Ligand code: HEM
């Protein structure tokens with residue numbers, strides 16, 4: 001949960017460029033397509049029956065914005081990720097029963113989405129900084145299981 | 147980890163009967179046999195090339211005793227496992243770079259070894275309490291990754 | 293499964309024999325207690341201790357494993373109905389197959405001290421992971 | 430792998446071509462930097478940026494994947510010697526195949542945006558998971 005100045009610079013330089021209206025929906029949609037058991041938690045979202053159905057689904061886009069907003073909040077509070085995600089940890093663990101491995105999977109799908117959008121700019125060191133972040137978010141979201 | 151007094155009593159009643167000279171070597175040996183990538187961390191122990199070589203290896207037995215002693219110390223301080231594992235976490239994460247999934251696997255191998263030794267006495271509720279324990283130990287040993 | 297793994301699995305499950313259903317039911321009970329999140333897949337079940345529904349379901353699981361050991365070279369076909377059920381209809385998280393597999397190993401360890409050697413433990417682990425791969429495919 | 434997965438993997442991986450060494454090396458570097466535990470498998474390598482050893486090894490990994498895509502219906506035979514090397518000789522942790530597979534997907538996403546659709550992403554993930562299953566067997 002501690003980033004060096006190099007890792008902080010990598011994360012912050014890229015994050016200001018992220019389209020917060022789209023990237024969350026892209027990551028959530030790809031999670032649902034690539035790891036189809038995750039659809040079990042989103043039956044209320046409607047048609048998830050094909051990749052095009054998932055990626056065009058308005059509830060997927062809308063929820064993805066909220067998910068990314070929580071990632072952004074975590075980026076603003078790297079030194080206190082457990083306290084930033086405590087309420088969401090209660091929700092996902094006590095109420096939704098999401099296995100915490102899926103937190104890791106969504107973090108890695110987000111990393112893939114960043115790579116897809118930013119290309120050469122998403123260098124191996126930039127990726128490594130983002131992997132520290134998404135691991136920290138996953139661990140904070142899983143805290144209520146511990 | 148927090149156990150109720152009922153769960154605490156079940157766990158400790160069984161733990162008093164555990165052969166601390168053998169069970170640790172049995173759990174470590176089974177980890178190396180069932181999950182052979184873990185052998186990479188014990189190359190100095192000599193021959194690990196067959197199950198009988200692993201299980202009879204004196205360094206496996208001696209090391210297993212140390213592992214079991216750490217579990218025993220942890221059982222004495224379940225509510226504050228950092229007080230038992232903070233330095234061991236530094237060793238396993240920062241110095242040895244053990245993937246933390248293997249902490250979980252060793253805990254589950256230990257549960258299997260306890261079942262193997264205690265038979266019908268290793269009831270589903272006793273197992274459930276021990277699963278809480280071994281999950282907490284694995285999470286405490288991974289603290290330096292967090 | 294290597295030929296040696298298949299030999300060990302056939303031998304161990306042969307010692308399980310007619311106790312397979314009882315062991316399946318016990319593994320489920322251990323799973324529901326140790327990993328209570330798994331209970332969410334069974335909203336229509338009585339999950340209390342001694343539930344006839346958990347017992348009956350354990351014998352169904354055991355029958356499927358027995359068929360798998362009988363057809364260990366062709367498990368995708370032998371288990372074909374269960375893949376659609378677990379992967380498409382129920383959408384069981386792959387992690388939960390690792391949880392049930394561990395509880396099956398714990399159950400076998402508690403009942404088959406002599407048979408559950410380190411080598412047989414390793415073969416049974418690979419067998420249950422292979423079954424899990426079919427049901428999640 | 431379905432025929433659709435095989436079709437998806439073939440067109441996407443076909444775009445790699447002469448970039449095999451560069452992309453393989455990049456995926457390895459992504460793995461070593463993001464997941465430093467994986468470095469314990471390469472004490473005998475120089476892992477610093479621009480390492481010729483990482484470049485040469487990256488080409489072998491990528492070329493092996495190209496051979497796997499060419500033999501996607503019989504990958505156990507197409508990867509058999511490499512399965513012996515990774516599962517028996519080196520004993521590579523299965524977790525690390527998930528880590529390298531993720532870094533390969535990241536590399537393909539960064540270099541082949543138009544090809545890395547959600548459907549192709551899913552097919553490539555399944556392909557790499559199938560390769561990983563063979564190499565850990
Ligand atoms: C790993 C990073 C994740 C973050 C930051 C995150 C964040 C959030 C946020 C902010 C909400 C809205 C809570 C509210 O409005 O009260 C939410 C809800 C939810 N999340 Fe997550 N989540 C993550 C992972 C996951 C995963 C991996 C799953 C399932 C596979 C999941 C399943 C859900 C569900 C089912 C809801 C409720 C949606 C609804 O029915 O309204 N989340 N999450």
Ligand code: HEM
Nearest residue numbers: 184187188212213216217242244248249250252253284287
């Ligand atoms: C999860 C529970 C574990 C516990 C409680 C535990 C406990 C211990 C203890 C008490 C020591 C002695 C430290 C010292 O003397 O300084 C030790 C050392 C060590 N542990 Fe662990 N360990 C665990 C898991 C693992 C795993 C899963 C691996 C590898 C896969 C591993 C690899 C090692 C190694 C390589 C050493 C040093 C051995 C040597 O000096 O040659 N440990 N551990």
Ligand code: HEM
Nearest residue numbers: 330333334352353356357374378382384388389392423424
């Ligand atoms: C070794 C692994 C497993 C085997 C062999 C297995 C086998 C079976 C069998 C034979 C059935 C009954 C099929 C039928 O009656 O049509 C079934 C149903 C079911 N299984 Fe599994 N299963 C396994 C793992 C799991 C896991 C890990 C879960 C969830 C944690 C799960 C949840 C269910 C559920 C919810 C049903 C439907 C129960 C009902 O509604 O009556 N299974 N399984």
Ligand code: HEM
Nearest residue numbers: 467470471489490493494511515519521525526529560561
């Ligand atoms: C898609 C997955 C992988 C593929 C296709 C693959 C391919 C290969 C190939 C073709 C070689 C032979 C090199 C030679 O003959 O000179 C090799 C060697 C090796 N692999 Fe992998 N590999 C994969 C995953 C991994 C992973 C995940 C690790 C560990 C984190 C690993 C560690 C090694 C090591 C240590 C060697 C020996 C390299 C040397 O000494 O030259 N491999 N691999």
